[PDB]
């Protein structure tokens, strides 16, 4: 087809897979027809095992059919390993002077080249602080509320070393969102930093943590706090007895505790991390990832989707508060001994050339970013890109949202000067790593398509009418019909909800996305089919936004829908009703918007607020009829469907008239 972009010749010669699509298809076919042998070989080849699984022909067991019993998957049962050991110790001392992170702060005067040897020292130091000053034991939960600095990777790996369970809270979340996650995870310890900065704006991490910790204590929790010195100590307060500066904890270490810390050898299905993730229903829930399968899957996808070789220099722009930073900043890259760029700042400070200054300075060859960022760079204009030397780039990656042809072409042919392959990687928190993706050198690309499934992955298109598999070119519900090593194993404390959310169609993992498969077998992701939003690349649920809106004292109820937004991809549209007698003013609407930002964070800011004067559209039971609100927010006033269940049909006329006025 004419929209196909061939892989570059040079990448084809370098590829771990081969120079032609036939090479990929040969491996893919093997990974399905001989699935256990495939993963056994990869696992043995590329990872360290203290103990291996007993049988190469049965490295997985599973059930995807609720009628046969509980849903479950297990990978490498019987094997024993450690993620920190694979990320760090095993590379030493051979690679002690190899750079692990080229770190730069938000402030371009702040830089450090952190070697693998230095990471080892930093990690054994912190692990010993955790074990012997905080008494952190295997299985204990530790919360992280950190900026993108070396200490963030150190903290993740130190917890893995001792078998603690991390839960990472994105630094953009508010105190209330942080507290909620610490409460649900029952963290014994919060690791944070004094402060960071986003361009010109200070980010007062410990000050926010103080409010979250006060809220947790008022509910009876006792959470200690360890604070890294990222700035000058003078942005935050410290509570005697609860809060410790990391430098003070370091000083208490014995000399030996700077050189060695025992490794906790983990069983395959021991929990590695909990990641709170927005869903179609209810508040964010903790997705559970275990040890052996996730380790293998995050690392193997990193290697093949980006074709990482030891002479490559890798830069992913994601934060550790989201799954992309787990799999594709810290765990996967370090397990394959990558040299990476670690960047605390933002793409527009000091100006929109910053990421390209990083690419040139560190000779980056693989850049993994997101369409929201790409759209913002495009809007800033090509001259911010072209002042940078991009000759070293050979692979560009995109994650988290659909990317249109114009942005894809701009990424490759302006950003990458037309000498790069592009890996548009589709996957989710629940899948651990990439699921549908190009591979450099061997995969013809279609701009806008994720292309072909990763090795071992069997996607299907389910018919939205009767929910069976569709053959041939087809559009419908995206599902996965067989297990893969990186699959999340449960929702923390609520396996019933896990089965209900993802396994409602027996035999399939239901993604929540829709997709079209074309006549070449390439997949085109068309977005969520449930109520989940994708706002500036952040996955957010309508329920926490509505719950946040409803905490404003004047608000009776609300309903949130998404709408197309040029920069954010999807914006947040709020319909809401106020108590009888409320004076509706611009200041009131501003206070409701600020309430959402207080309860959740800036990432959930409403873009439009429409006052439903008579009420939200609702059935006799009280159920808000959301399709009505969806159609209105788009201007489509004739395609609403049926309203006969509306206890208050008077509401409709008001909703269309108001929208025409606001003109979103
Ligand atoms: C890794 C982030 O994982 P999550 O934060 O859990 O968001 C997962 C959700 O992002 C969306 N998505 C992710 N990658 C793509 C892509 N390449 N093209 C289109 N849409 C994408 C999709 O809707 C999915 O279900």
């Amino acid at each position: 087809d004419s929209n196909v972009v061939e892989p570059t010749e040079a990448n084809g010669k370098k590829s771990h897979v081969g120079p032609h699509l036939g090479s990929r298809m040969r491996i893919y076919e093997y990974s399905i027809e001989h699935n256990d042998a495939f993963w056994a070989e990869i696992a043995r080849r590329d990872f360290y095992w203290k103990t291996t699984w007993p049988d190469d022909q049965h490295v997985k067991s599973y059930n995807f059919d609720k009628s046969k019993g509980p849903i479950f998957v297990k990978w490498f049962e019987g094997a024993v390993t450690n993620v920190c050991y694979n990320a760090l110790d095993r590379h030493l001392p051979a690679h002690k002077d190899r750079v692990c992170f080229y770190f730069e702060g938000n402030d371009p005067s702040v830089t450090e080249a952190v070697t693998y040897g230095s990471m080892y020292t930093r990690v054994v130091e912190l692990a010993n602080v955790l074990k012997y000053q905080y008494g952190i034991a295997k299985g204990d939960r530790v919360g992280l509320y950190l900026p993108m600095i070396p200490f963030a990777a150190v903290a993740m790996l130190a917890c893995a070393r001792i078998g603690a369970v991390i839960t990472v809270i994105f630094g953009g979340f508010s105190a209330q969102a942080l507290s909620s996650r610490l409460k649900d995870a029952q963290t014994k310890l919060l690791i944070t930093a004094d402060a960071s900065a986003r361009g010109t704006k200070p980010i007062p991490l410990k000050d926010v943590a103080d409010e979250a910790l006060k809220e947790c204590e008022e509910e009876g929790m006792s959470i200690a706090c360890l604070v890294a010195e990222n700035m000058n100590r003078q942005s935050c307060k410290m509570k005697e007895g609860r809060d410790t500066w990391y430098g003070d904890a370091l000083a208490r270490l014995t000399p030996e505790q700077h050189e060695e810390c025992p490794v906790e050898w983990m069983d395959a299905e021991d929990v590695l991390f909990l990641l709170y993730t927005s869903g179609s229903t209810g508040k964010p829930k903790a997705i559970v990832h275990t040890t052996a399968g996730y380790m293998v899957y995050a690392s193997t996808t990193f290697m093949y989707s980006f074709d990482y070789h030891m002479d490559d220099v890798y830069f992913c722009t994601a934060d550790i508060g989201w799954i992309t930073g787990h799999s594709y900043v810290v765990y996967g890259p370090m397990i394959h001994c990558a040299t990476s760029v670690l960047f605390e700042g933002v793409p527009n400070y000091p100006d929109y050339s910053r990421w390209w200054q990083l690419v040139e300075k560190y000779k980056v060859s693989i850049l993994y970013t997101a369409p929201t960022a790409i759209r913002s760079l495009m809007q800033a204009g090509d001259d911010y890109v072209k002042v940078g030397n991009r000759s070293t780039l050979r692979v560009l990656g995109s994650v988290g949202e659909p990317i249109n042809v114009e942005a894809w072409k701009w990424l490759r042919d302006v950003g990458g000067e037309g000498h790069c392959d592009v890996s548009d990687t589709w996957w989710q928190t629940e899948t651990g790593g990439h699921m549908i993706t190009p591979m450099p050198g061997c995969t013809p690309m279609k701009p806008g398509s994720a292309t072909l499934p990763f090795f071992g992955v069997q996607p299907v298109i389910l018919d939205p009418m009767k929910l069976h598999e569709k053959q041939g070119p087809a559009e419908g519900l995206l599902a996965i019909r067989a297990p893969w090593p990186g699959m999340a194993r449960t929702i923390y404390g609520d396996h019933a909800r896990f089965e209900k959310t993802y396994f409602g169609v027996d035999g399939y993992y239901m993604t929540g996305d829709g997709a079209r498969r074309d006549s070449d077998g390439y997949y085109w992701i068309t977005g969520r089919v449930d109520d989940v939003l994708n706002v500036s690349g952040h996955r957010i649920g309508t329920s926490e936004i509505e719950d946040a809106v409803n905490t404003h004292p004047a608000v009776v109820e609300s309903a949130v829908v998404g709408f197309p937004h040029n920069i954010k991809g999807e914006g947040i549209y709020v319909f809401l009703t106020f108590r009888q007698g409320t004076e509706v003013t611009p200041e009131l609407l501003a206070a409701v918007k600020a309430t959402v930002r207080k309860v959740i964070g800036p990432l959930a800011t409403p873009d439009v607020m429409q006052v439903a004067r008579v009420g939200l559209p609702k059935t006799r039971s009280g159920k808000i009829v959301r399709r009505i609100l969806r159609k209105v927010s788009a201007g489509q006033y004739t395609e609403l469907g049926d309203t006969s269940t509306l206890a208050n049909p008077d509401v409709v006329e008001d909703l269309i008239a108001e929208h025409q006025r606001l003109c979103s």
Side-chain angles (χ1 to χ4, degrees), residues 2-619 621-636 638-652 654-659 661-664:
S2 70
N3 62 333
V4 172
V5 175
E6 291 301 321
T8 74
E9 175 86 340
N11 281 354
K13 284 186 236 232
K14 192 147 191 244
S15 165
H16 291 297
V17 174
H20 298 305
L21 180 59
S23 303
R24 176 173 175 158
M25 293 312 301
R26 196 170 53 240
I27 303 183
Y28 179 78
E29 176 71 354
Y30 185 80
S31 78
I32 304 311
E33 278 307 288
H34 302 278
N35 182 250
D36 288 85
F38 171 79
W39 285 117
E41 179 175 347
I42 292 304
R44 285 190 197 278
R45 189 187 70 193
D46 291 350
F47 306 85
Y48 181 84
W49 306 93
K50 191 185 181 257
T51 305
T52 50
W53 54 92
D55 183 358
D56 280 354
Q57 286 310 311
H58 291 107
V59 295
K60 59 167 190 295
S61 56
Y62 75 104
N63 174 46
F64 272 16
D65 180 348
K66 297 186 307 306
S67 70
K68 299 317 187 50
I71 302 302
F72 78 91
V73 79
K74 292 192 249 177
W75 285 90
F76 308 113
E77 185 175 39
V80 178
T81 189
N82 183 282
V83 170
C84 186
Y85 193 91
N86 272 277
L88 193 43
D89 301 50
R90 71 167 177 160
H91 305 311
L92 296 167
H95 301 291
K96 72 179 179 76
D97 290 328
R98 173 172 175 84
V99 172
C100 181
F101 297 119
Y102 288 116
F103 169 64
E104 296 218 354
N106 179 70
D107 177 353
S109 74
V110 169
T111 69
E112 186 178 6
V114 185
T115 62
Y116 274 89
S118 177
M119 288 295 294
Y120 173 86
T121 302
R122 297 167 188 241
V123 164
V124 300
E125 281 170 344
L126 174 59
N128 278 319
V129 166
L130 296 180
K131 286 176 74 81
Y132 299 121
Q133 300 174 29
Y134 286 99
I136 300 308
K138 179 185 183 188
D140 286 343
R141 274 79 59 208
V142 175
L144 305 188
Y145 190 62
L146 287 165
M148 292 299 283
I149 61 176
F151 194 74
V154 172
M156 291 176 65
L157 292 184
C159 290
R161 186 182 200 81
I162 67 180
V165 172
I166 66 177
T167 196
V168 183
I169 303 95
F170 174 56
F173 278 123
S174 71
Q176 292 183 38
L178 169 57
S179 174
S180 170
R181 288 160 175 70
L182 303 176
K183 286 188 279 220
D184 188 79
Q186 291 288 303
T187 56
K188 186 177 292 199
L189 170 69
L190 174 63
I191 302 179
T192 191
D194 63 323
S196 183
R198 136 183 296 265
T200 196
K201 188 191 174 179
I203 301 170
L205 291 168
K206 175 56 168 50
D207 198 63
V208 174
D210 281 356
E211 173 58 37
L213 290 165
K214 173 170 67 183
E215 297 167 5
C216 290
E217 290 156 12
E218 209 253 316
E219 300 215 70
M221 294 182 76
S222 186
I223 307 176
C225 186
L226 179 63
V227 187
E229 299 96 332
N230 188 46
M231 312 284 243
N232 54 13
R233 238 152 145 117
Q234 87 188 10
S235 170
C236 59
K237 292 185 148 210
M238 296 286 276
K239 186 185 177 177
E240 183 56 38
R242 185 191 72 192
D243 299 340
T244 297
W245 289 110
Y246 183 64
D248 293 327
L250 271 179
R252 295 194 263 274
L253 293 187
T254 70
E256 309 86 90
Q257 293 173 337
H258 295 264
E259 306 211 325
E260 287 183 355
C261 176
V263 173
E264 185 71 30
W265 289 108
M266 311 298 291
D267 295 309
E269 293 296 334
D270 286 343
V271 173
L272 181 65
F273 64 86
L274 310 178
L275 187 50
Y276 288 86
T277 303
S278 295
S280 187
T281 318
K283 80 187 225 229
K285 297 305 192 318
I287 303 302
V288 177
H289 280 287
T290 58
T291 295
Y294 174 82
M295 179 184 69
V296 168
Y297 199 68
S299 305
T300 299
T301 52
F302 168 79
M303 179 173 66
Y304 285 110
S305 306
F306 301 131
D307 200 53
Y308 187 80
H309 292 76
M310 290 290 287
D311 66 337
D312 283 303
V313 175
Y314 172 81
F315 181 19
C316 174
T317 65
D319 194 276
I320 57 163
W322 313 106
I323 189 71
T324 302
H326 285 57
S327 300
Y328 302 115
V329 176
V330 177
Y331 293 130
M334 286 187 68
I335 292 165
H336 271 295
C337 204
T339 295
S340 301
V341 170
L342 187 62
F343 178 45
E344 183 190 24
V346 289
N348 71 333
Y349 183 82
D351 74 8
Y352 261 119
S353 293
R354 183 67 185 277
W355 283 356
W356 309 110
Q357 294 170 328
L358 292 167
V359 160
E360 171 168 355
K361 184 175 181 169
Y362 300 114
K363 298 178 146 271
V364 171
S365 59
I366 303 166
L367 174 70
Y368 189 30
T369 189
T372 292
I374 295 163
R375 294 190 297 271
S376 290
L377 303 184
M378 294 176 74
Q379 186 181 84
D382 297 346
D383 300 307
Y384 284 111
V385 182
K386 294 180 101 308
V387 292
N389 185 335
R390 286 111 53 232
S391 63
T392 56
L393 290 173
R394 70 187 196 81
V395 170
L396 307 169
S398 183
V399 54
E401 37 190 317
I403 190 178
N404 78 345
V405 171
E406 185 183 5
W408 189 107
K409 286 281 163 165
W410 184 92
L411 178 65
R412 184 189 184 269
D413 294 338
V414 179
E417 311 184 296
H419 56 69
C420 291
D421 297 338
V422 179
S423 294
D424 175 9
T425 62
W426 175 86
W427 60 296
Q428 330 174 280
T429 301
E430 301 93 330
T431 72
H434 304 148
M435 300 290 282
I436 304 175
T437 179
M439 295 167 188
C442 67
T443 310
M445 291 143 289
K446 297 186 190 191
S449 177
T451 77
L452 296 168
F454 196 83
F455 303 137
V457 175
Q458 296 189 56
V460 301
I461 301 293
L462 300 176
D463 169 25
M465 282 177 286
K466 289 186 78 181
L467 304 175
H468 292 91
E469 292 175 29
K470 291 171 104 171
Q471 312 294 336
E475 187 157 2
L477 303 169
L478 183 61
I480 311 293
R481 69 164 291 283
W484 66 102
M487 188 182 112
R489 303 301 207 252
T490 189
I491 290 168
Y492 193 55
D494 199 350
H495 198 63
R497 183 180 304 258
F498 183 79
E499 296 196 0
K500 177 168 193 70
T501 300
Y502 304 106
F503 291 87
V505 181
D506 281 333
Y508 305 89
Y509 170 79
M510 185 73 68
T511 65
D513 285 308
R516 179 180 73 88
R517 191 179 57 228
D518 71 19
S519 56
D520 291 316
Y522 280 31
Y523 288 80
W524 301 77
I525 310 292
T526 60
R528 300 294 294 203
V529 298
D530 57 10
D531 302 328
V532 170
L533 300 192
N534 189 334
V535 181
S536 294
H538 297 133
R539 174 174 169 173
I540 304 174
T542 56
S543 283
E544 61 263 30
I545 301 179
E546 290 162 11
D547 296 336
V549 171
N550 295 346
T551 70
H552 187 286
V555 170
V556 159
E557 60 186 346
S558 65
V560 172
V561 302
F563 74 102
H565 191 294
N566 162 42
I567 281 300
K568 298 189 185 195
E570 192 161 42
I572 299 169
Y573 201 112
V574 178
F575 298 83
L576 73 178
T577 67
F578 294 107
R579 192 169 322 294
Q580 236 173 36
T582 300
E583 184 171 359
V584 179
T585 64
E587 302 90 275
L588 173 64
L589 298 180
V592 176
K593 172 181 289 224
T595 298
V596 178
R597 291 174 58 107
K598 246 185 98 162
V599 173
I600 303 176
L603 75 171
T605 303
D607 292 287
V608 177
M609 303 207 346
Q610 181 171 328
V611 180
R613 288 119 71 126
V614 298
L616 301 178
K618 280 185 288 173
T619 66
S621 71
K623 187 256 267 171
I624 287 161
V625 180
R626 280 157 194 281
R627 183 204 219 277
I628 296 178
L629 304 178
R630 297 197 294 266
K631 285 284 170 143
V632 167
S633 63
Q636 303 166 253
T638 64
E639 322 184 41
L640 295 157
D642 191 7
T643 53
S644 296
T645 67
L646 288 194
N648 53 352
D650 40 293
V651 299
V652 177
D654 177 68
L655 299 165
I656 307 98
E658 257 307 280
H659 175 87
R661 269 193 34 214
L662 305 163
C663 221
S664 58

